[PDB]
Every structure is written in C-alpha cells, then in structure tokens.
C-alpha cells in the first residue's frame, strides 16, 4: 500500500505514476539520463508513512548522485526537480502567484522593504509581471540551485521556510536599483536589467543578491583603511574595523607608517614597542565578531619592504615560534618598487629604515620614484639616521619562502599602481590594496572614528559573463546596465563611518570584472600557456574597458561627473592606453578597434560619473550560479566537488561534452609565463588591479622541490609586464 504523509500531517496512498510524471517532465530535452535508474535508487528508500517532502528530497539526491563527466545532464535533471520542490515549498503549488500579491504579502510579513509599495503603483507591478519568465528557473544547474536556496532566496533561517523564487529576486533587485528613475524610462531599464541578470549575462555580488529588496541597507563588502602613526589613529582604525566586520566586510589595512621598535617615544604614545603589538590589536578587532575568535571576518595588512622591522613582519604567520611574535590569522601584502628589484639584480644590499626617521621617504615611495631614489640614497649615507643593512638576496628569499609555505604572503608593486592608474599621484596616490588584492583606491588616515577629514575606500563590484555573449558589441548594452545599476546602489546603501561616505560620494568608484574566461578561451580554441590567446585577450579587454568608459561618460552627461573627478588622470585627457607598460608591445600585436580619441575628447569635456570602472576579482559563488569557470582562472578539473548538509555537490565545466579537449586544466600548464602574459595584457586596460595567482607543481622539478631561482624569475616576469599585484601561490598536493 505504502502510505504517504503530507504537510498538515495527513495520510494519503502512494501514487507512483505521479512521481514518474514529474521525472519525465524534468528529463525533457536532456541526453543520457535514465529515469528508471533514478526510480530504482529512490523507490527502495521509501517506507510506510513517509512525508511527501522526503520523497522529493530522495529523488533529488538520487539524480544528484549520478552527476558525472559521462552524463552531465543529470545536473539539470536534479536542478529542475529541486526547483519544483522549492516552488511547492514556498507557494504550495508550482505556479508562482502574481507579482503584486507576492510583494503585498511579503511587505506585511516584514520580509520586503515597504518602499517598494510606495515607489511603484499596482498597475506598474502588473506591467512588471508581464516581463517575468518563470520558465527561466529551468535553466539553473543543481549546484546553482543549492547556492540560491542556501544564501540568496529570502527565507526563515530558524524554521527553514523559503518565501520566494529566483525570478522574483531578479525582478525586484532591478525594481529597487532603478526605483528613483524618471517614470518615462524607469520600467524600460527595469526590464532590460532583469533580462541581463536572469539570462546570466551580468553577475552580482552575494550581499546585493540576498539583501536588495529586503529592509536592510548594508551592502559594502570591501573597505580599505589607512592607519596613521599615532595612538589616536590606531584607535580610530581599530574602531572602524569592528564596525565593518560586524557587517561582514573584508578589510584591507595599511599599517606601514607605524614607527619601528625602539624609535623615539614621541608624545606619551608608547611606540617604543613597535608594530607587532598593534598588529595583534588589529587581528582581535578583525575577529571581534567571529564565532570562536578565529572563523569569519578577514583582513590583509600591508607594509613597505624597507620597514625596519620587515624581518619580524615577514614571519608573522610562520607556524613555528613564540605566540608573542606571531599574528597568524591575517594575510600580509609586501610593498615593493623598482629600486628594491634593482638591488636584487645587482646583488647589493637593501637599507631598512623606520618611517618616522626619514622625512618624505614614505610618500615618495608611492607618488614619485625619482624623489624616492634621491631621498633613499641620501638617507643611506646620513649617519644620524637609525638604519640596518640586509643582503637583497636574503630579504627576497625570506619573503618568497614564507609566500611559498603559507601561500598568503602577497606582493604589491607600488610604482606600477601609481604610474599606470586613474589617479594623479600628487593629489590622490594609491597606497594599498584590499583583501583579495584587486582593488586599488586612494585613502587618508583618520584621527577619530568620526573624523570627517579622513578617507576610507569602498568598492561596489559586479562582473560580465564572457560565456553568455555572442559578440563583443553586446558589451555596450551590458556596460550601460551594469554602470547605472551600481551607481544607483551608491546612493541607496548606508555608511556607518563618515570617512567611508566621503570616498564613495566623492569618487563613486566601481569594480566590474569578468567570469567564465577559461570557457571563453576554450570555445575560441586558445590556451593559457603558449601565447596563443594574447591577441584575443587584448581585443576582448579593449572592448570591455571601452564600453565601460562610454557608459560612464554618457551617465555624466545626464547626471554630472563625480565631485572629485578633477583628481583623476582621466580629467587631464590621459587614458589607460597612454600609460601602460611599454614591454607589452613585444608580446601582442593586435590593433585598437575602437575610437579612443573621440572618447578622449568626450571624457575631457563631460567627465566621468565614476572615478574607476574595472577590477578583476576572484569569484566562487557568482560563477556557481551561472555554471561558469571562476573569474579568469583555469579550472582545476572537469568536475568540482563541494560538501553540503544534503550531500556531495558536483558541477561539470560548461559544455564538457564538446570542449573537453579544448580546456587547459590548471596543472596541465607547464609554467606561469603564458598566464602572466595574459594578466599583463589585461592590466593595460583595467582601472584597478587583478587577483593574479602563481602555481607550482613539485613533481615537475628535480627532487620534488621548487627552486628559489624559478620563484624569483616569475616574480620579475610579472614586474616586467606591468602586473600590479600578486595574490595566492598555489602549490600542488601531489
């Protein structure tokens, strides 16, 4: 008989034909999927009085467990089944309610913002409902649905109730972002943005995806804080971190100016103890709202290579040492410039100084390399200055050894960040990066949490899916929607600290990047390691930068340039194509295809809405939702395995069936040269920076040990092609 129990807890008789119908429905259009195979595996686990929800979970998992490279279409079979179960779970039926009724109910329950009902009329919601296509939920993959259900869809985390479906999320994010638009164009934009996000052309960050439409206003994910050399600034920095990590933001801290251990105690401020103690205080601030003082909340601290305590700073995450000299739960970014690299090449020494003892040096390091060398050589000979000399080879090897063993000791080439940038280094120099090393914005130290003369950088992100466009001229529409939606967001969100508001309203900085790069290269028949993708990469990143500046320029015409537009190089008629590292000319010969000189003039005359537009970030979740390869990285394998409460999550790279031999997997690359050239070509056009990785496989080297020579050679190649920063170092576990 097999009794089935329902949601109200009432008994009906099992209906095996109904189940089969759903399976047959879900399978429509898929290849190599056996409905019988799924029925055999799930029916055996049924029993008298099994709830209906449990039947749904059982068949979902059955299909999920058959996902493989040989039958990738199980990804969709499981997904559709999952979508079906979520529909019934939220609406009690498959067919979603009308938009207007849904929004009314959610506003009354306190789950949606009430401004939605004030900002749009019932007729306008009826119009919006005709845009929605609920059948687009049938295009997700199983792993995507799991992320949607896990961290995007509005739900009751305690009771496990899901209140909405993907398409209401997409339509309402659009509705909120363009709510302040004139009624003559408002809904035309709403429809276009909804089409772009629901068909995976534009990806949005997690915070936006889960919050916009709900009553919250906290959407910042990266804050850049610069700390001055004083107890008041140390306290302000610390207070600012606590406020921002409680809202789940990644922090990027510049603590380079703090004077060295021993330096003259100046003002009562016991700076006799040096950097370490204060670094430990920033670590506890970063972990202040973390479970058991270690999980959640992250930061990357930056310091110059010539700091007098650099040798103690470089081994802070070494897992072998006294607790009083170790700050293990933060990542560090070392700041280098051309002079430092020269000393290494010539086999000379590097002189270490405390920032407080060398007037003008620290600022010169970022804004003027000629003045840096002048001051640096002067102070080397000045006998009144406290200093220390170390062999450049020793310092560079100590740094690289720590980078290699932890993977988390990053590099920032400060000269490249200021000679090739959107900002004028005399007025607004770039002095640090963020958590994942792709943001590069100007900052100013605070003397108090509420100091209005300080500046904290924030950046709003998003990305273009290179696997969902047919030709590069589709980026014109996409760039308009991406820029307009994110610029609206800058006025929509809250700012807990005055200095953060200042930078956002002054410069209106954005960071739009790409996902699915590997897939894109595979379908064009190119690889990473042999130089075959150089010209296509050049051509592709010229289109992205060109259309992003165009959209921003059009927006400034309409609504005015950003208040501090005059501090940008763009304001003086200087473009990315005028300041790139000239060595790039030897590795790419593609011509420019767009009219940059027409654009040059327009920017000069009407200005830009946003000071920065592009940045290439990492991405795990966004890419999962659109079944795309992460950011610009090569896949580690054809199938991704992730752990979940419900089971093992598998995801097959896009179009594996036809492109398995076209892909070039991470550990198939012979080395980092090909990849480092592509990053250099991308950096010619990007406003900010890229999260570049370096990868090494021990089994490709004699005795299973990566030679220091190879590590330093790749460091220098990166520098030669204009790479601004370097993120993770991946070493193989084989």
């Amino acid at each position: 008989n097999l009794l089935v129990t329902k949601r109200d807890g009432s008994t009906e008789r099992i209906n095996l034909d109904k189940i089969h119908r759903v399976l047959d429905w879900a399978a429509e259009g898929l290849h190599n999927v056996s409905i019988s195979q799924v029925e055999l595996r799930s029916h055996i686990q049924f029993y008298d009085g099994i709830k209906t929800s449990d039947i749904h979970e059982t068949i979902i998992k059955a299909a999920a467990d058959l996902i493989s490279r040989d039958a990738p279409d199980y990804q969709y079979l499981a997904a559709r089944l999952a979508i079906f179960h979520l529909r019934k779970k939220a609406y009690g039926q498959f067919e979603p309610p009308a938009l207007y009724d849904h929004v009314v109910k959610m506003v009354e329950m306190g789950k949606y913002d009430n401004h939605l009902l004030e900002d749009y009329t019932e007729e306008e919601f009826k119009q919006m409902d005709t845009f929605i296509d609920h059948d687009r939920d049938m295009t997700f993959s199983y792993a995507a649905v799991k992320q949607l259900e896990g961290k995007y869809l509005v739900q009751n985390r305690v009771t496990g109730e899901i209140y909405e479906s993907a398409q209401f999320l997409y339509i309402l994010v659009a509705a909120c972002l363009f709510s302040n638009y004139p009624r003559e164009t408002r809904l035309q934009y709403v429809k276009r943005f909804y089409d772009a996000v629901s068909t995976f052309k534009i990806s949005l960050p997690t915070p936006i995806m889960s919050g916009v439409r709900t009553p919250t206003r906290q959407f910042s994910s990266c804050v850049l804080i610069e700390c001055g050399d004083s107890l008041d600034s140390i306290n302000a920095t610390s207070s600012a971190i606590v406020k921002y990590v409680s809202q789940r933001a990644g922090i990027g801290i510049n603590a380079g100016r703090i004077r060295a251990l021993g330096s003259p105690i100046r003002g009562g401020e016991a700076f006799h103890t040096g950097c370490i103690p204060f670094y430990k205080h920033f670590q506890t601030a970063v972990k202040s709202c973390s479970q058991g003082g270690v999980r959640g909340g992250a930061a990357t601290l930056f310091y110059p290579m010539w700091h007098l305590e650099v040798e103690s700073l470089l081994v802070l995450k070494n897992n072998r040492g006294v607790e009083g000299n170790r700050v293990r739960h933060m990542d560090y970014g070392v700041q280098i410039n051309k002079l430092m690299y020269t000393r290494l090449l010539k086999g000379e020494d590097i002189t270490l100084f405390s920032p407080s003892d060398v007037p003008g040096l620290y600022d010169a390091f970022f804004a003027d390399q000629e003045e840096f060398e002048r001051l640096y050589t002067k102070y080397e000979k000045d006998d009144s200055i406290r200093k220390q000399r170390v062999k450049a080879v020793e310092l560079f090897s100590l740094m690289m050894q720590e980078r290699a063993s932890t993977g988390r000791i990053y590099i920032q080439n400060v000269d490249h960040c200021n000679t090739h940038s959107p900002f004028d280094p005399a007025i607004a120099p770039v002095r640090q990066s963020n958590l994942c090393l792709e943001i590069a914005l100007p900052t100013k130290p605070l003397n108090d949490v509420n100091d209005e003369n300080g500046e904290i950088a924030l950046c709003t992100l998003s990305a273009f899916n290179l696997g969902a466009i047919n030709n590069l001229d589709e980026l014109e529409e996409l760039a308009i929607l991406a820029v307009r939606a994110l610029d609206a967001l800058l006025d929509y969100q809250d700012y807990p600290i005055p200095a953060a508001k200042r930078g956002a309203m002054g410069r209106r900085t954005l960071g739009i990047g790409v996902i699915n790069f590997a897939y894109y290269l595979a379908k064009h028949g190119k690889r990473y390691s042999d130089g075959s993708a150089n010209n296509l990469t050049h051509k592709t990143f010229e289109a992205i930068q060109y259309y992003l500046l165009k959209a921003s320029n059009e927006l400034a015409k309409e609504q005015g340039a950003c208040p501090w537009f005059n501090e940008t190089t763009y304001a003086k008629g200087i473009l990315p194509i005028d300041t790139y590292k000239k060595d790039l000319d030897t590795i790419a010969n593609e011509p420019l295809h767009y009219d940059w000189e027409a654009l040059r003039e327009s920017i000069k005359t009407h200005g830009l809405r946003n000071s920065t537009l592009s940045a290439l970030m990492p991405s795990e979740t966004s890419s999962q939702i659109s079944n795309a390869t992460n950011g610009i990285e090569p896949p580690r394998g054809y199938v991704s395995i992730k752990a979940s409460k419900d089971g093992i999550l598998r995801q097959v790279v896009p179009d594996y069936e036809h492109l398995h031999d076209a892909y070039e997997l991470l550990w198939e690359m012979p080395g980092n040269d090909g990849y480092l050239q592509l990053v250099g070509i991308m950096q010619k056009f990007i406003d900010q920076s890229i999260s570049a990785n370096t990868n090494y496989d021990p089994s490709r080297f004699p005795s299973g040990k990566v030679p220091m020579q190879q590590l330093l050679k790749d460091l220098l190649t990166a520098y030669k092609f204009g790479v601004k920063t370097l993120f993770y170092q991946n070493t193989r576990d084989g």
Binding site: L345, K705, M708, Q709, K713, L716
Partner: peptide, 16 residues
C-alpha cells in the same frame, strides 16, 4: 619544498 639557491649572475641580465 623549496631549494634556496640563488644565482645572482644569472638574474643580472634581466631587463625590468
């Protein structure tokens, strides 16, 4: 595992 052996004579030619 790394082999800490740097040849400064080999790196010197490099052009930044």
């Amino acid at each position: 595992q790394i082999d800490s052996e740097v040849d400064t004579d080999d790196l010197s030619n490099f052009q930044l």
